[PDB]
């Protein structure tokens, strides 16, 4: 609905994101749109230090506030990581830390670039009378020339949007169950699986828009956070807002609400039996917009789809359920192949880790999540 801020077309993505700020903030917008040139020239920190503190008060509506979060988060990652080879700043200047943390407190997000910034709000249509396809879209911000951030973020978005075509169906699932409407339940489950299967096919475009070296040695550096990170082992000082430094985890698709939400729907015990996997995915919910965090706990308050299906001795209903689970398994198995190409192999070619968001061991995290999904199948 509108209380959960779910768009009928793009789901959890911010529909038609704002591309321009109020003239007042032109000195934010100039740095953010020139992070590649400004980083390469050793000038980015300077241009940021030369800024004046700006009030967040001329950011009147939600889309303005979301764009500014994106601006400031990207600037913050540029400031902290610099050229991306290990010369890092552990203090973020008040002229930026302060409106960043104010705007953040307002939107109930942490003061760091999150998935909802750099994917869900970091896009535009080129031509608005053409649909949501890669050739009709661009991102609004990048970090370095050749970082494949347009590829990574838009392919990420297009998989989101495809998967979000199944959110539509969730109220049908629970109404069907409450109304003991066997046939519509089953058709609804089959439709959710069709959407998750299409999402996998969209994922296949990753290879054309991202290459391994750029992802592993550049993009991944600028998405990284300061939680569990030796390079900023105590956190980052938000000068002029908080006294001590604070840890926050980097961007992660574990912050995506669509995939968490099909784990909840299908009763895959992703945030439960654990343990590292489940605690991580629970933590990442505090990096989601508040209404999206609240959709997820609302789903959890509904009766279990899994228990309903398990208890019915109905082989077609079990197949439809399994078809949804299987689709999550196929997505996650494909995803580990991508993690092999874009992380593990480049990692091997360097003069067992390489960590993962918030310090995690990432192969174990992803294999545990996949295994948990596979073992939710009712039949092999
Ligand atoms: C170069 C491409 C990609 C790489 C290297 C990659 C890597 C990773 C890694 C290392 C994790 C572990 C969690 C973390 O450390 O933050 C992760 C989690 C995740 N990634 Fe990706 N990813 C890529 C693209 C995508 C895309 C396009 C999707 C869209 C479906 C995606 C969906 C997810 C999800 C949902 C999770 C949470 C784990 C789960 O639900 O199974 N990733 N990804
Ligand atoms: Cl590799 C790991 C640890 C090092 C920093 C980068 C994270 C992955 N972060 C992601 C960010 C976004 Br946006 C979207 C993502 N999809 N899948 C993974 C992911």
Strands (DSSP E) found in the chain: 91-92, 124-125, 137-138, 237-238
First to last CA, the chain: 36
- For 304, the 3-state DSSP assignment is coil
- Our CA angle for 221, 225, 230, nearest 5°, is 85
Ligand 2 within 6 A of CB of 118: yes
Phi/psi region, residue 287 (left: phi>0; alpha: psi -120 to 50; beta: rest), is alpha
**DSSP for 82-133?**
TTSSS---SEE-HHHHHHHHHHHHHHT--SS--HHHHTTTS-EESSTTS-S-
d(CA 163, CA 280): 22
| Domain boundary pick from 248, 282, 301 | 248
Residue 101 corresponds to which tokens in the numbers above?
A: 């943390």
* 91/9 same-domain check: no
d(CA 63, CA 66): 5
Which ligand is in closest contact with the Cα of 328?
Answer: 1
- Our CA angle for 240, 243, 249, nearest 5°, is 95
* 207/98 same-domain check: no
Domain span at residue 254? 1-17+146-223+249-380
* 114/209 same-domain check: no
* 89/165 same-domain check: no
* 131/190 same-domain check: no
- Cβ atoms 92, 82 nearer than 8 A: no
* 35/83 same-domain check: yes
- Cβ atoms 123, 153 nearer than 8 A: yes
Ligand 2 within 6 A of CB of 271: no
For residue 60, how far is the Cα from the chain centroid?
25
**DSSP for 236-266?**
BEETTT-SS-B------GGG-HHHHHHHHHT
| Residue nearest atom 16 of ligand 2, based on CA coordinates | 253
Method: X-ray
Task: Check whether 276 is labelled as a binding-site residue.
Answer: no
Is the four-CA dihedral 39, 141, 198, 283 of positive or negative sign? positive
- Nearest C-alpha neighbor of 174 from the set 266, 292, 244, 260: 266
* 344/199 same-domain check: yes
Residue 311 corresponds to which tokens in the numbers above?
A: 């208890």
d(CA 35, CA 347): 26
d(CA 130, CA 44): 36
CA of 126 to the centre of ligand 1 (A): 27
* 133/151 same-domain check: no
- For 45, the 3-state DSSP assignment is helix
- Cβ atoms 79, 48 nearer than 8 A: yes
* 205/320 same-domain check: yes
* 7/116 same-domain check: no
- Cβ atoms 232, 221 nearer than 8 A: no
Q: Which atom of ligand 1 is nearest to the CA of 343?
A: 5
d(CA 191, CA 188): 5
Ligand 2 within 6 A of CB of 149: no
Ligand 2 within 6 A of CB of 139: no
Ligand 2 within 6 A of CB of 250: yes
d(CA 356, CA 106): 28
* 152/243 same-domain check: no
Return phi, psi of residue 366, to 5°. -75, -40
């Amino acid at each position: 609905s509108k209380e959960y801020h779910i768009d009928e077309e793009v789901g959890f993505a911010l529909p038609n994101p704002q591309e321009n700020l109020p003239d007042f903030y032109n000195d934010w917008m100039f740095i953010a749109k020139h992070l590649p040139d400004l980083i390469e020239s050793g000038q980015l920190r300077e241009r940021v230090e030369k800024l004046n503190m700006l009030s967040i008060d001329h950011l009147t509506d939600h889309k303005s506030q979301r764009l500014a979060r994106l601006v400031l988060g990207c600037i913050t990652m540029a400031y902290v990581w610099g050229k991306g080879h290990g010369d890092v700043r552990k203090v973020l200047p008040r002229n930026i830390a302060v409106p960043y943390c104010q705007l953040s407190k307002k939107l109930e997000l942490p003061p760091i670039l999150v998935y909802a910034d750099c994917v869900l709000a970091n896009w535009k249509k080129k031509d608005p009378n053409k649909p949501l396809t890669y050739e009709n879209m661009d991102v609004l911000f990048s970090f370095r020339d050749g970082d494949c951030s347009k590829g990574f973020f838009l392919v990420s978005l297009l998989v989101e949007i495809a998967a979000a075509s199944a959110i539509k169906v969730i109220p049908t699932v629970f109404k069907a169950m409450q109304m003991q409407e066997r046939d519509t339940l089953l058709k609804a489950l089959l439709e959710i699986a069709s959407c998750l299967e299409k999402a996998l096919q969209v994922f296949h475009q990753i290879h054309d828009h991202v290459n391994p070296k750029a992802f592993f040695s550049v993009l991944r550096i600028y998405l990284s956070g300061w939680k569990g990170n030796p390079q900023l082992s105590d956190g980052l000082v938000y000068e002029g807002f908080w006294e001590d430094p604070k840890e926050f985890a980097g961007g992660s698709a574990g912050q995506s609400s669509v995939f968490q939400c099909f784990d909840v729907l299908l009763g895959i015990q992703q945030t439960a039996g654990g343990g590292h996997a489940a605690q991580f995915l629970q933590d990442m919910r505090r990096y989601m917009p508040p209404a999206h965090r609240n959709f997820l706990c609302s789903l959890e308050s509904n009766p279990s789809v899994r228990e309903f299906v398990l208890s019915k001795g109905d082989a077609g209903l079990r197949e439809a359920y399994d078809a949804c689970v299987k689709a999550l398994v196929s997505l996650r198995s494909y995803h580990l192949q991508i993690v092999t190409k874009y992380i593990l192999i480049p990692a091997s070619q360097q003069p067992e880790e390489a960590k993962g968001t918030g310090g995690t061991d990432l192969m174990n995290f992803l294999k545990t999540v996949r295994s948990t999904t596979e073992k939710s199948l009712l039949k092999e």
